[PDB]
From a paper:
Pendrin (SLC26A4) is an anion exchanger expressed in the apical membranes of selected epithelia. Encoded by the gene SLC26A4, pendrin belongs to the solute carrier 26 (SLC26) family.
Symmetric inward-open and asymmetric homodimers were observed with approximate percentage of 75 and 25%, respectively. The symmetric inward-open conformation most likely represents the energetically favorite state, existing in the single binding-anion condition, Cl− for instance.
Author numbering:
A (entry chain A), B (entry chain B): 18 to 595, 651 to 737
The structure:
């Protein structure tokens, strides 16, 4: 209704005297360290409950229908998971059985330490691509070939399959151990704010570039062209040119099979997405298409007739645990860091989505610990990095998923696919597995249609998307993440270095002050000029603040004094011989400041001293208490600049100025 | 006096309707580019006035008394300049005759393009150290030695003086051209805000730690010990160990000579600063110490008797211009960048000190062009990077200096120091010139006494000082600047990622709201909780903003909704069989926000939606106009979240709630 107040004009001290402050909390380092370490059993119960979340949902089961739902969803997601694992095994330059291994052990590990319920832990295209890239970097093909075979002219230095793939698997296991150690370090130290720097446009551009690189790699695999695995700067462009110049060295059968399975998978996926209300359970297009491919590839001997590319290297068994070859972490520190960061980011995103969808929440540090333990356990059994694929976890949620027991049931499908079945997948074409990932790339390729939407929004975030996407294509993929985080931090610094200062004026017959560049009928006090400066002053925006003041007052506080001293000598010589007209006061409406960066309070005091020489009083309007407490310690309230110069509100300063000019002419 | 107002409670729209905005300025890309390029003759006279500042002070000279002081000061700083010029040449691993060139040619260029009047352009101890750091790297001593001399057992691969130091000059000259071009790029592209990132604690800790490297490097010349010029990580630490283990390989004559001039020059320096009011012109202690040292070294043949280290390599002449050996700029990109920044930083810092004292100002972008052309012109005559020494410019100012003509007169003293005199400095000991620089290091060594002062002030700035000082000691000196700029910018991101949120409450019988953790007798509205959050929300502090609200309301907006639906099933089953108590509204006092980072504004719409399900209204208090315009474009004002939810002031949000609960029970 009515907004009426009547209080005296408390500037800084008329309000500080009769208002008693609170006693600050004493440090008591000994007492603080003693009070932190609790001795009661309740804290132990709480930490053992939050560290092993299985003790919460397991005793509270609802077996009646949850058992059947988890059984069917686990069968479905286990088929999908073993398919995705045997497909992504090619992305890591490792044999196919290690994909089935990586689809089994992380699921078992994410059962007693996991805190989610709709997450299918396993392989991931981006993470597998990064692992394969670093494996090719630290173990190329030209470093294992042995000259043997009695060639035509020189030594027959053909391919040396065998110990080569073993070395690749060992390198991948060491990388996964390092990633798990880094994740466990991040979880134990409770540092979870390191992943907050991955903005949505940053991760979007990163996923787009990773999808482009995955498409290039899978096109290389489908076309069956021998590439020199170029890595470094412009590696994707180099390998694309190398593929385009070696098109003649392809396989027609593999090409047409890949095209057919691509179009079939895409059509069935879009049909299922369109007519979702017709059938609740999505049809496993990948399972039926790979079964049909294996069937048509077993009848006709495509390996001998058309010389197609099949696996024919599935051992169909388990492997004893192998100790990781520690000692190569020096050349994999940054790679493991980037891999762990992107894996945790994508996993937390998927978990938060499927948790807000199903009305629950997940913890960050617990997810970090669970993923670290899963990667450590997978590193001991020759597996690659484990994450959650949005396409794989979508099947488990659509078929109906209540808890991770469906994941444990999915591990039985991978179990039977390791021990007994799996030799039936011998004649399966490698181009078929290399195509289902491309069919799954449709989700990340559609993110390019969101760049025009971000441009209509804050343009600073739209540049981060394009910058991260382009930079993660030129200078590889692992350096693209570091080039995006630093660019995002630089953009944040630029938004606080070049603020949006205004010409704050008065509204008639009221007390609220609005900008003069946004409203027409606003008048300012006679002689007084109000200025608002957001983005609190630090060592970078000090010159910007000086320029803003000089532009809002019309002149320069230094040049006016220079002209005054130049004109004073003309008068000082006549005794022996024979600009700042409108500006009366400056009310700085520093209400959007948080810190002051004492290097900046020095410039503030310098401004106050300079404007005092030209008879221009500089006042303050909305300084917070946390800033005044810093200014008191930084040596600002001397015998000249007292607290009366500061004010509580913007209208109080104008009222004080009016009363002063009315009572003191 | 009295502060009384009476206005209706305009929330967002009751003030937007009857207040007409202003028409935004049209882009007019065709007209904006045409309006920028001026065609009037006054614009051409303006750009030529600032580019050549000599056309301002030279026609307006005051030869009546200015020319007299320039002559006495020019000879004063000229004798001190030719000494520091030849002494700092040892820091650049260049011969001593090329140091005199760096004190003559840059002065001629800083006469028609310079914008200062109390700056003595020439060598610098810190800058010459960075130049000599890259000369030893790309041209070490172990890369020019030739096996010749018929040694005892192996080939006599002794020192190869001659083409060795001759190649060092060409390498040093190419560096200055690249440094000069980079300074012209910043001046040409008008980008001058790149040097604003060098805070005072950053440049303070850098020059302090650089003084340690100068002390260790010059101690090598004083003790006359052969060092293996270790560079890279822990370079200063490694070279300090080699000197201490090779103390026996010293020169007693060079030791007692350097230790004597250290205590002599330092004592007279502090004695002159103490009794400053006794004599206006400071006595040239550095000039009287080198003439006496040369006299005693000329009488007694210290070169032959005591095997002392003398120069004996002064050609005493000029050299034709040499074209820069272009092609090594690839290995000097990071090297020239670090030198070009510290050259401009120290120049403007020293220039601004003597500018405010003598009542004048210097241009920022002009110093880039001024020092840019000087470094390019000096690169064509075999010189190193030119800057201004605080010790050298103090002599020119104390003796009385009005303009750069005193510097031009000093160039005549350097002129005669090349053509006629200079051979008299043949028996001058190298330890004497290596000690006059150490005596001047007292100014930067005293900066360590400012670390405790910064600790009582903002502690974030005190950590940047110690970090830059330590990091510029471990990983060399050029990487220390980059490691400090990134750490300083990272500290700004940390201060805006973890803000200082409070518990804003109401003051009795008034309208001002203060924090609850800073005042004792403050009451809050019944049910309403006010929260203030500085450091505007972006992709990093979005999770912290969630935890901030959850900490001030007592619960979590998601966990309460999880418990509600967990409890509603108990009620929904009884029909077929047979927390958020205090929180009424939330007023977010977002008055310290500048940008929104739409990535983060998605959470603001989520927060309003989350608390809406638990019957908790989330309002806003002090949202600025520049911020609300971002929400309109980013898709925030939908059919549910209207503008009435926002308010103009904090008290209007409370008045709207109090009037609502009374009229609507």
């Amino acid at each position: 209704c009515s907004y009426t107040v009547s209080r005296p004009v408390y500037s800084e001290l008329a309000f500080q005297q009769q208002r008693e402050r609170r006693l600050p909390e004493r440090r008591t380092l000994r007492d603080s360290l003693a009070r932190s370490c609790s001795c009661s059993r309740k804290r132990a119960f709480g930490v053992v409950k939050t560290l092993l979340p299985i003790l919460d949902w397991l005793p509270k089961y609802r077996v009646k229908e949850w058992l059947l739902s988890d059984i069917i969803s686990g069968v479905s997601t286990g088929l999908v998971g073993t398919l995705q694992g045997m497909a992504y095994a090619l992305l890591a330059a490792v044999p196919v059985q290690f994909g089935l291994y990586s689809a089994f052990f992380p699921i078992l590990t994410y059962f007693v330490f996991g805190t989610s319920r709709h997450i299918s832990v396993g392989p991931f295209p981006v993470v597998s691509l990064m692992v394969g890239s670093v494996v090719l970097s630290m173990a190329p093909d030209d470093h294992f070939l042995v000259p043997s075979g009695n060639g035509s002219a020189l030594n027959s230095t053909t391919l040396d399959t065998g110990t080569r793939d073993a070395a690749r698997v060992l390198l991948a296991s060491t990388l996964t151990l390092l990633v798990g150690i880094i994740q466990l370090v991040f979880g134990g130290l409770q540092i979870g704010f390191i992943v907050r720097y991955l903005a949505d446009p940053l991760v979007g551009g990163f996923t787009t570039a990773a999808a482009f690189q995955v498409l290039v790699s899978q096109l290389k695999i489908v076309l069956n062209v021998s590439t020199k695995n170029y890595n470094g700067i412009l590696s994707i462009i180099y390998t694309l040119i190398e593929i385009f110049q070696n098109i003649g060295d392809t396989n027609i059968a593999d090409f047409i099979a890949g095209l057919l399975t691509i179009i079939v998978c895409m059509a069935v996926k879009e049909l299922n997405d369109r007519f979702k209300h017709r059938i609740p359970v999505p049809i496993p297009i990948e399972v039926i298409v790979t079964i049909i491919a294996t069937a048509i590839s077993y009848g006709a001997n495509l390996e001998k007739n058309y010389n197609a590319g099949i696996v024919k290297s599935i051992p169909s068994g388990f492997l004893p645990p192998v100790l990781p070859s520690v000692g190569l972490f020096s050349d994999m520190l940054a790679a493991s860091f980037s891999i762990a960061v992107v894996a945790y980011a994508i996993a937390v995103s998927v978990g938060k989505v499927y948790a807000t969808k199903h009305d629950y929440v997940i913890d960050g540090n617990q997810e970090f610990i669970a993923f670290g333990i899963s990667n450590v356990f997978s590193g001991f059994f020759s597996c690659f990095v484990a994450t959650t694929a949005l396409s794989r976890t979508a099947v488990q949620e659509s078929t109906g998923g209540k808890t991770q027991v469906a994941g444990l049931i999915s591990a039985v499908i991978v179990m039977v696919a390791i021990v007994a079945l799996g030799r039936l997948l011998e004649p399966l074409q490698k181009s078929v597995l290399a195509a289902v990932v491309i069919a799954n790339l449709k989700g990340m390729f559609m993110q390019v249609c969101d760049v025009p939407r971000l441009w209509k929004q804050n343009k600073t975030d739209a540049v981060i998307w394009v910058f991260t996407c382009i930079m993660s294509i030129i200078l590889g993929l692992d350096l693209g993440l570091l080039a995006g985080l630093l660019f995002a931090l630089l953009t944040v610094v630029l938004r606080v270095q070049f603020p949006s200062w205004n010409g704050l004026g008065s509204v008639p017959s009221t007390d609220i002050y609005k900008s003069i560049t946004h409203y027409k009928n606003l008048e300012e006090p006679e002689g007084v000029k109000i200025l608002r400066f957001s983005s609190p002053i630090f060592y970078g925006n000090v010159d910007g603040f000086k320029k803003c003041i000089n532009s809002t007052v019309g002149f320069d506080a230094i040049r006016v004094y220079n002209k005054r001293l130049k004109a004073l000598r003309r008068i000082q010589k006549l005794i022996k011989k024979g600009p700042k007209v409108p500006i009366h006061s400056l009310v700085l409406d520093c209400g959007a400041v948080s810190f002051l960066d004492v290097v900046g309070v020095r410039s503030l005091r310098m401004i106050v001293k300079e404007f005092q020489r030209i008879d221009v009083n500089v006042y303050f309007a909305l300084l917070q208490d946390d800033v005044l407490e810093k200014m008191e310690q930084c040596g600002f309230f001397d015998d000249n600049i007292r607290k009366d110069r500061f004010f509580l509100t913007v209208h109080d300063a104008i009222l004080h100025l009016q009363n002063q000019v009315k009572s003191r002419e």
